[PDB]
Write a protein that binds this ligand. Structure first.
Ligand SMILES: CCCCCCCC(=O)OC[C@H](COP(=O)(O)O[C@@H]1[C@H](O)[C@H](O)[C@@H](OP(=O)(O)O)[C@H](OP(=O)(O)O)[C@H]1O)OC(=O)CCCCCCC
Ligand SMILES: CC(C)CCC[C@@H](C)[C@H]1CC[C@H]2[C@@H]3CC=C4C[C@@H](O)CC[C@]4(C)[C@H]3CC[C@]12C
Ligand SMILES: CC(C)CCC[C@@H](C)[C@H]1CC[C@H]2[C@@H]3CC=C4C[C@@H](O)CC[C@]4(C)[C@H]3CC[C@]12C
Ligand SMILES: CC(C)CCC[C@@H](C)[C@H]1CC[C@H]2[C@@H]3CC=C4C[C@@H](O)CC[C@]4(C)[C@H]3CC[C@]12C
Ligand SMILES: *[C@@H]1O[C@H](CO)[C@@H](O)[C@H](O)[C@H]1NC(C)=O
Lengths: 332, 804, 145, 158
């Protein structure tokens, strides 16, 4: 007498409220620590609300091997006494055949693709749908929290970026399309993150950022070829060519696009990121504070250069807290 | 009406020489020549989209030679090449090669085997043939119809279509020639003059299959409107207009995921409308229960329906399943015959008994197997016949009349009645008996059979009750006069074991164990195996007494004093009254009604279209034979019989072959019934064999027959569905289209009818059962439409189980 | 020219639509100020519900057919052909997986390869029409190979 | 008795085992009723032994549902195409599986012969001797994947 007809996740409204409207209006993209609203439809009218409410429980699972010890699986009832800080569900509006349920997630939840499952007592588990959980710069309890709304928009929502090239005395701004809200960017980023097997640490922005940076540097080393070849259309085609292997490759003359790709991935996953250019950067020194330059009698360099060189320009900055560090190192 | 021949420029394998070989011919139907030297089956001409598109493309800029004064292939080829050069279709340097190709030897199907076969060929720039460069595609028509001249009108003309591939051509070129006078060319090996010539040459190009192009051209020429237009054509414009009109009425069928014949038959009026559009402008115009109304028409129709299959009725019995069915039906007809003969002898003072009934059953079964239209029917005595015999004997005893002579006169009237019924085709009224009455009667008869089977065991238990003490000195001849220990319990054990073994072997027939051939052999012989096992089990128990089969010592009358083999219609002991001779018609009418209803409903049950009966059944012939044999046997002092429902249904099921669940075929043959009748007649001569067979094994067999006779009845299925949730109902038309409570109300009405019939059976007026059974037909035809819709009645009561 | 389908089937549904389905809109119109007929094929990045369709099913594909009045061009039949092409499963899968007009053209060519043309005949017989069944089965096998 | 108790408390889902009613009340009540069987002599005095024999036969035929050895013995009398989709059929040859089942049948026959002798107290030792057989002789004639498919602790495909 408590069959389930369908479950409307209300992707458009929730994505507009969770600042993921640019991603999609069909798939549910929500950010941790913020409630999202779903509608549950019953095949038959519900006679008594309270026993039926006591008969239903919700389970959220992520990963191939979900478990409670890994914090990848959580079972929570639908009641007003649930921990809104943790996983919880409460009926805000109800009809004879429909329940409007507000579902909350913990502020330190594991990111990735989730499956929402409903359990009725004395009945098999039923899948209600799928949703993707992301970091929440708008949530104060989140580690990626930003104080300013303008900073949040610029460092997460703005897909039109500027990569500054050239010299220190002549800075040439290059228009760049990060495209972190392209349809396949989130899936590609999560599939790349899936190479890391420490899924319990995926709730930590530091671990996710470090893993993504290492993997993207490995992909840049494996995919970037030695030297239109210099025609760029943003970070999304570069990421597609680095992961799938199909598309126009990036050559060594534009190896600086690794920072843009990393910023795109971090912004898509919900980590506030920006691209920073440092002119006259000494690379390849290994910490040494000396650069040796060699010139002939004509004021010219005969060789291709030393290991330690002062590059004309050269990085990704991410905003998060540092719980594992001493106090005072939060920020970029 | 013209003959169109398609030839393709191919090369042989034995000599690698390029030549012309015919590929398909049109006689208003298309036949294709495969790679074996024999033509495929005729079929309608069907064309691909690309073939018609390329045909239109090459026809729009094609070369036409109308009313050409040529009578030889060389002259036609020379004129066509000259007009090709004039119209810039080909280059002047290609004329020699094309003339060489067009004047090659035209081979046919007769010399295909003389060579090493034919291979696709492409004409090259030089005199040597090359191989095609594009991937080869085998013809659909060849793969489909080829993997297995009289109809040509004398005043007809031929059309030759030539297709060839030449890589030295810029674009495909079409050549259309209409001769001034039709002439016979060496290219065509038939004595039909050639009027039209189609030449299609070109290079290898995508979306251009020159075989399909030639097929499209031949299909266009075979159409009557285009043929008339080409005969009346004065320029290429008229031919182009005719081609455009041909394409206007062309119908394209797109590919679909689920091909259904109903959705395909929705195309018929569209094709009719396109045909009407095609011929709106052309001068040509587009091209067993029934009442015959003839005396004895139904009998002749049944004879012509069944007797052509007489040869198959002997050869189809060469299978062990037929022998197993013979063994099954032998017991299933002998045991009720013995029981009914004993009861009749007890009730009628042995005027008719076991021996007379067995002889009558044997004779009638032999004659019905040799001459009947539905040999699967089993002819034997029935319970209502016993009730009528008892009533008639009581009437004759009350009125002091010779009862056997009364039976003689009843049979004499029965012969006249059945002759009158067959003469006017009185068996056409059986078509008004729908699945409703048939299923009600079958379910009632199965319930009666099961009830009698259990009541016999109850009577056995009552005769030998369970008591603490028994008298060890009890006379056994002819029957035990007192209770005996271990008798009823052993009878119950034997019956239960027989039923269990029969059911287990029936399940093993459909099981997945053992090799399939041996599995089917064991399953077919399941009943004989169970009978043999239980008979052997009872055989080793010497001390305990069980009732056995009893047969007469020899072929003799039951009571010699009462009557002999031939009974005088004028009287045996006293002169027969005159008034009774005319008054016997009404009892004869009742007997005819009983036998008619029983036999016709049994024939309806065993000849349902869902049972895969692909040989036909004759109602009139079977009814005439049954009633005539009954009337003849009445003269010899033998009981009249009828087609019993249980025995015939069991015989049909034993001969039914189950596919991989689904009925596949039925072993319809006359050998089984003939052998059963012969064994029934010889049952007296095999007394030692039958004397060791207990009745409990036969009771278990009867229970198995009763529980297996309910498989094909939808009334039993709905009775089972009455105790099921609605979501567990099977996907059937009467559930998915009818509400559950409506179906339950229908089943309840049928249950009420069954209860009324059962109450009628349990009354002294049990001879009125056929009338109450008939009264269900007015119920179905009147009262059910008043409370059920037409669609509901069609779904619930369907003759072939169809969704309206 | 009155439509054959209207004259035949109209001179006398939403439940069977799957819940996880998308809609295709085919628009046909005649404009005399156009030089040649033009086809417009649109596949949306995300399926959306437009005001054009009065059903709660998102629209993924859009067909636009505009052009002047020309012989042998019935825009109602053109829209029917486009809708039949889109309703076919192979072309639908190819259009979902299409990355350029070349793949759509190849799918259309394959669709036309397995198309079956029935020419008009004087005597229509159901036996000769049922001789077409294995040819259609073979064309279906070629389509889904 | 324990297998029958577990099966009686087993709840079957919509074929597939769903849950088992694991509780201490059942065994306690059974022991209490066994102890009180003397005090309910009139009730037990009217219960025939034949009903109990039928119950014992039912228990014996129902205790074979969960044994894969019985399933392979049944498959010995089936065509290869009728074998169910199980890891030990789709990954192991039919004759190899039949040889494994025959080895198990030989072991069963040896145990049955040991039972029918006055030295029937040596049955646990012969039963233990099957473990060295499985751990030594079977790898000598069967591959590791074949043994994992045929002898799986949780019925998994290696
Ligand atoms: C005493 C019997 C002989 C003992 C000698 C022992 C040696 C021995 O018996 O092997 C021969 C034969 C193997 O041959 P094989 O497996 O190919 O035989 C298949 C089997 O008969 C299936 O029943 C058939 O399917 P169906 O039923 O028509 O649907 C199938 O035909 P198809 O449909 O696929 O085309 C047959 O191919 O045995 C068996 O049948 C397997 C069961 C053996 C069980 C153990 C034997 C009881
Ligand atoms: C229905 C069939 C049998 C025919 C109809 C029966 C009637 C019309 C006929 C058939 C045979 C006839 C009988 C034949 C012979 C005799 C002997 C004679 O000395 C007196 C009349 C009598 C007794 C006849 C009476 C009428 C009779 C009974
Ligand atoms: C009488 C015994 C043998 C069988 C009893 C079962 C019958 C009477 C019951 C079982 C299921 C029942 C149906 C279940 C559901 C509905 C839908 C409801 O909106 C109207 C009544 C209706 C259609 C019920 C009618 C009665 C019903 C058919
Ligand atoms: C001994 C009784 C109980 C059962 C007899 C069935 C056994 C012995 C039979 C039935 C099916 C048979 C198999 C059927 C097919 C093949 C394939 C062939 O290339 C090698 C032999 C092999 C693998 C057979 C081995 C023997 C086999 C397993
Ligand atoms: C035979 O008929 C006579 C009467 O004619 C009767 O007395 C006798 O009992 C009958 N025989 C038997 C065996 O019943």
């Amino acid at each position: 007498a408590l069959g389930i007809k369908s479950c409307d996740f209300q992707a458009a409204r929730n994505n507009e409220e969770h600042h993921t409207k640019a991603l999609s209006s069909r798939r549910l993209f929500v950010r941790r620590g913020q409630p999202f609203t779903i509608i549950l439809y019953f095949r038959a009218p519900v006679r008594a609300f309270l026993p039926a409410l006591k008969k239903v429980a919700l389970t959220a699972q992520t990963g191939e091997q979900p478990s409670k010890i890994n914090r990848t699986q959580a079972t929570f009832p639908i009641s007003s006494l649930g921990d809104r800080k943790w996983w919880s569900a409460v009926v805000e509006e109800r009809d004879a055949q429909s329940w409007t349920i507000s579902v909350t997630t913990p502020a330190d939840a594991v990111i990735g693709h989730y499956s929402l499952l409903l359990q009725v007592s004395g009945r098999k588990q039923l899948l209600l749908g799928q949703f993707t959980l992301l970091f929440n710069p708008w949530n104060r309890e989140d580690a990626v929290f930003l104080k300013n709304e303008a900073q949040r928009m610029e460092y997460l929502l703005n897909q039109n970026g500027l990569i500054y090239l050239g010299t220190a005395d002549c800075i040439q701004a290059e228009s760049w399309d990060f495209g972190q809200f392209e349809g396949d960017v989130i899936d590609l980023s999560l599939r790349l993150l899936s190479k890391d097997k420490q899924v319990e640490k995926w709730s930590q922005p530091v671990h996710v950022a470090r893993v993504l940076g290492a993997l993207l540097h490995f992909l840049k080393e494996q995919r970037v070829l030695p030297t239109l070849l210099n025609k760029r259309r943003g970070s999304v085609p570069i990421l597609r060519q680095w992961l799938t292997g199909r598309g126009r490759p990036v050559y060594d003359g534009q190896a600086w696009v690794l920072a843009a790709v990393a910023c795109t991935v971090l912004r898509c996953l919900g980590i506030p990121a920006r691209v920073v250019t440092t002119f006259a950067s000494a690379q390849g020194t290994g910490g040494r504070l000396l650069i040796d330059e060699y010139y002939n009698e004509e004021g010219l360099q005969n060789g291709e250069g030393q290991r330690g060189r002062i590059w004309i320009f050269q990085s990704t900055e991410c905003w998060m807290t540092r719980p594992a560090l001493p106090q005072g190192y939060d920020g970029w | 009406k013209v003959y169109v021949e398609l030839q393709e420029l191919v090369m042989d394998e034995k000599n690698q020489e390029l030549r012309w070989m015919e590929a398909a011919r049109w006689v208003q139907l298309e036949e294709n020549l495969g790679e074996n030297g024999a033509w495929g089956r005729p079929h309608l001409s069907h064309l691909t989209f690309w073939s018609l598109l390329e045909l239109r493309r090459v026809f729009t800029k094609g070369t036409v030679l109308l009313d050409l004064q040529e009578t030889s292939l060389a002259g036609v080829a020379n004129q066509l090449l000259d007009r090709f050069i004039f119209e810039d279709q080909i280059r002047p340097q290609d004329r020699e090669e094309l003339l060489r190709a067009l004047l090659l030897k035209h081979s046919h199907a007769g010399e295909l085997e003389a060579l090493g076969g034919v291979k696709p060929a492409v004409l090259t720039r030089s005199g040597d043939p090359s191989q095609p460069l594009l991937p080869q595609h085998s013809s659909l028509e060849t793969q489909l119809f080829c993997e297995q001249l009289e109809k040509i009108p004398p005043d007809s003309e031929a059309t030759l279509v030539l297709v060839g591939r030449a890589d030295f051509l810029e674009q495909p070129v079409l050549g259309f020639v209409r001769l001034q006078e039709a002439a016979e060319l060496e290219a065509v090996e038939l004595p039909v003059p050639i009027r039209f010539l189609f030449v299609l040459l070109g290079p290898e190009a995508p979306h251009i299959d020159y075989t399909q192009l030639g097929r499209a051209a031949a299909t266009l020429m075979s159409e009557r409107v285009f043929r008339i237009d080409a005969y009346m054509a004065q320029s290429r414009g008229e031919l182009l207009h005719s081609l455009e009109g041909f394409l206007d009425c062309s119908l394209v069928l797109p590919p679909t995921d689920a091909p259904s014949e109903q959705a395909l038959l929705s195309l018929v009026p569209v094709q009719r409308e396109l045909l009407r559009r095609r011929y709106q402008s052309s001068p040509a115009k587009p091209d067993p229960l029934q009442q015959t109304g003839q005396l004895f028409g139904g009998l002749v129709r049944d004879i012509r329906r069944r007797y052509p299959y007489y040869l198959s009725d002997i050869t189809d019995a060469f299978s062990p399943q037929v022998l197993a069915a013979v063994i099954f039906i032998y017991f299933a007809a002998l045991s009720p015959a013995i029981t009914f003969g004993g009861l009749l002898g007890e009730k009628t003072r042995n005027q008719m008994g076991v021996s007379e009934l067995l002889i009558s059953t044997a004779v009638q079964g032999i004659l019905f197997a040799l001459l009947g239209a539905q040999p699967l029917l089993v002819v034997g005595f029935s319970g209502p016949l016993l009730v009528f015999e008892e009533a008639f004997f009581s009437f004759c005893e009350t009125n002091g009349l010779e009862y056997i002579v009364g039976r003689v006169w009843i049979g004499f009237w029965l012969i006249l009645l059945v002759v009158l019924v067959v003469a006017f085709e009185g068996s056409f009224l059986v078509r008004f008996i729908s699945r409703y009455t048939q299923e009600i009667f079958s379910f009632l008869i199965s319930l009666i059979f099961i009830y009698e089977t259990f009541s016999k065991l109850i009577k056995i238990f009552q005769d030998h009750p369970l008591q603490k003490t028994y008298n060890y000195n009890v006379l056994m001849v002819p029957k035990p006069q007192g209770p005996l220990p271990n008798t009823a319990l052993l009878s119950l054990v034997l019956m239960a074991g027989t039923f269990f073994f029969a059911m287990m072997l029936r399940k093993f027939k459909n099981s997945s164990y053992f090799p399939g051939k041996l599995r089917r052999v064991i399953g077919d012989f399941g009943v004989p195996i169970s009978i043999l096992i239980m008979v052997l089990v009872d055989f080793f128990i010497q001390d305990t007494y069980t009732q056995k089969l009893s047969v007469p010592d020899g072929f003799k009358v039951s009571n010699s004093s009462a009557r002999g083999w031939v009974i005088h219609p004028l009287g045996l002991r006293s002169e027969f009254p005159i008034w009774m001779m005319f008054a016997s018609a009404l009892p004869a009418l009742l007997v005819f009604i009983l036998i008619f209803l029983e036999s016709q409903i049994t024939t309806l049950i065993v000849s349902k279209p869902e049972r895969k009966m692909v040989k036909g059944s004759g109602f009139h012939l079977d009814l005439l034979l049954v009633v005539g044999m009954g009337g003849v046997a009445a003269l010899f002092g033998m009981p009249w019989l009828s087609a019993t429902t249980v025995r015939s249904v069991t015989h049909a099921n034993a001969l039914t072959v189950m596919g991989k669940a689904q009925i596949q075929e039925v072993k319809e043959q006359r050998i089984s019934g003939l052998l059963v009748a012969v064994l029934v007649g010889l049952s007296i001569l095999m007394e030692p064999i039958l004397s060791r067979i207990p009745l409990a094994v036969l009771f278990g067999i009867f229970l198995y027959m009763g529980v297996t006779s309910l498989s094909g009845i939808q009334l039993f299925d709905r009775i089972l569905l009455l105790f099921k949730p609605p979501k567990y109902h099977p996907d059937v038309p009467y559930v998915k289209r009818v509400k559950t409570w409506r179906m339950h109300l229908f089943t309840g009405i049928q249950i009420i009818c069954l209860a009324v019939l059962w109450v009628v059976k349990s009354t002294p007026a049990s001879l009125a059962l056929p009338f109450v059974l008939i009264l269900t037909v007015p119920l179905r035809r009147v009262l059910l439409p008043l409370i059920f819709r037409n669609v509901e009645l069609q779904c619930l009561d369907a003759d072939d189980a169809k969704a309206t | 020219h009155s439509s054959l389908e209207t004259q035949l089937f109209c001179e006398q549904i939403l439940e069977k639509i799957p819940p996880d389905s998308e809609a295709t809109l085919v628009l046909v119109g005649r404009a005399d100020f156009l030089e040649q007929p033009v086809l417009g094929f649109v596949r949306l990045q995300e399926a959306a519900e437009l005001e054009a369709v009065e059903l709660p099913v998102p629209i993924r594909f859009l067909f636009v057919l505009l052009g002047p009045e020309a012989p042998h061009i019935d825009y109602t039949q053109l829209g029917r052909a486009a809708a039949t092409l889109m309703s076919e499963r192979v072309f639908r899968i190819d259009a979902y997986m299409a990355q350029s007009r070349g793949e759509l053209l190849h799918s259309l060519e394959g669709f036309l390869d397995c198309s079956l043309v029935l020419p008009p005949t004087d005597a229509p017989s159901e036996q000769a029409l049922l001789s077409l069944v294995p040819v259609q089965r073979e064309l279906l096998r070629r389509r889904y190979q």
